[PDB]
Design a protein around this nucleic acid. Sequence first.
RNA 1: GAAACUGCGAAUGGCUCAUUAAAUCAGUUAUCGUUUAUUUGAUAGUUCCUUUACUACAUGGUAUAACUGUGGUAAUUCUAGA
RNA 2: AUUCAUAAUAACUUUUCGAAUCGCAUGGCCUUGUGCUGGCGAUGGUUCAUUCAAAUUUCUGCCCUAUCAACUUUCGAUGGUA
RNA 3: GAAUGUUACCGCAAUAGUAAUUGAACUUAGUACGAGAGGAACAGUUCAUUCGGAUAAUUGGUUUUUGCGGCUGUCUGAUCA
RNA 4: UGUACAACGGGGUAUUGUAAGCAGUAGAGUAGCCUUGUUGUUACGAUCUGCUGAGAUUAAGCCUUUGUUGUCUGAUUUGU
Lengths: 59, 126, 59
Amino acid sequence: QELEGLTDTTVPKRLGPKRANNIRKFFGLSKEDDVRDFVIRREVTKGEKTYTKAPKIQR
Amino acid sequence: MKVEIDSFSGAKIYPGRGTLFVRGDSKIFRFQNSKSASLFKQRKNPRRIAWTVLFRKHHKKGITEEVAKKRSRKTVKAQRPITGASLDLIKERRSLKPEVRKAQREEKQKADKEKKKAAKAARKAE
Amino acid sequence: MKLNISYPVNGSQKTFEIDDEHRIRVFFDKRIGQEVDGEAVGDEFKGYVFKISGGNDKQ
RNA sequence: GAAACUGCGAAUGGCUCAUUAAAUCAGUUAUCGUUUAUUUGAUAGUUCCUUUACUACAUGGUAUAACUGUGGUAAUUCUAGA
RNA sequence: AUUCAUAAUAACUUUUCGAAUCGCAUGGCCUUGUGCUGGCGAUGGUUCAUUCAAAUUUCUGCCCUAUCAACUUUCGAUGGUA
RNA sequence: GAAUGUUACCGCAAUAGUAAUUGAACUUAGUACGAGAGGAACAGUUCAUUCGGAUAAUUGGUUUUUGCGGCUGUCUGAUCA
RNA sequence: UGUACAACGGGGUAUUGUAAGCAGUAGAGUAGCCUUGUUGUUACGAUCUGCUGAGAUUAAGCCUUUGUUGUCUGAUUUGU
């Protein structure tokens, strides 16, 4: 039997990776698959305008 | 009724039985019998008395109770939402490993723009 | 008492207030790291097994 | 650009004169008897380990804070769990 | 003034250091490749020196008391070897 | 403990003796009483003092259980005992 | 001549506190050996560890018993 408050509902990981090889293993791509495209971006609504702030890539 | 434990021997004390001693530091001890009380007065140590629970513990006698804690080997097996990743689209993009030629196709236009910008800067310098 | 129970797969967590002392007496004389099944303490937790991670006392 | 991590500093300064009568201290020597963050100036071609596939060198890996949320207690610059 | 500095051989080390760091300018060579080279810096780092110091330290020097003339040395007091 | 016909059991009770005692606290009530100062009692409850009669679950003491163990000196060749 | 009695035994409960013997790469360390050590082994060595909450004692005023072995007709006195 499933618990309404824990099992039924599910919650997000608030962040994605910031490290390159972490992304490469997150998506299992390659040493060459140009990680700059596989980036997670977080759209916002400050007002009518929106933007996603693809964070950064260290390493 | 609470069933207490001997401060010295670790044995069990039922009510109306044994004694209770109170030391100058306001501490309490409970004795099942005058035996334990007398050895305590003689300030022996239980770890060297062979009929005590502390002794049998520290020497690992009757120690078949605790066995071990096993080792876990299992993955998460759950792709959680990154909250800006759209886990459906995230699985779609993790499955987009092949067709990597689009990366080089975009890199070609980017390299072209790089030379174009170098030329534009070198010309604006004039 | 209270049980702060966490389902880390979804990433969720919830409090549960418990009575019926001879349900919760199962937990007595256990270590932080051992596991117990849940129907003994509540049939809502039937087939479930929880591990302990910590806790707080009065005061 | 708050917060948090990291690096620094917090051993300076300030206050008082209780102790202490070859002890402190003053002046004068020495370290061929030693440590020295910091500055300042100089200063590593040599480290692939059977070193002919053993290797990412256009560069390797695991945490974890802050944060999300659940809570504890009367309280504290208390805190756990995920 | 030295067993100094420094150098050389034999090895030893659980193995030290030898930049996986960052901001600007972005330039030159071409067999035009995201090819090869290339500046101004900040940080950090091994050792030597320096500076800031620090710790010990030489010599000489201190108030009243003899109604204190003997003190130290058991177990550190003076010295020696390790 | 003889004798009462024996022996055994169950009993009556003449007589004699006699044992229970004292206090505090709470409440009654800071009421009654009294100007105020001050300040009760009966009933009820909880305990205690002195005395007595039993008992020994527990606590304590005692220990020739010479029960167990240890220690010294000596003797049994040594070890064990 | 029997839910008979006793003596032994077994079990229970108690008391004490972990027997003797054997083993050990435990052991303060010390002699000696040679195949010289690459733990090299032999002798000494209070003590320690394991077999060991073992062993011993346990009714004389403890409990209990499907056990074994035995005992169970001697004298005296009494009458309404």
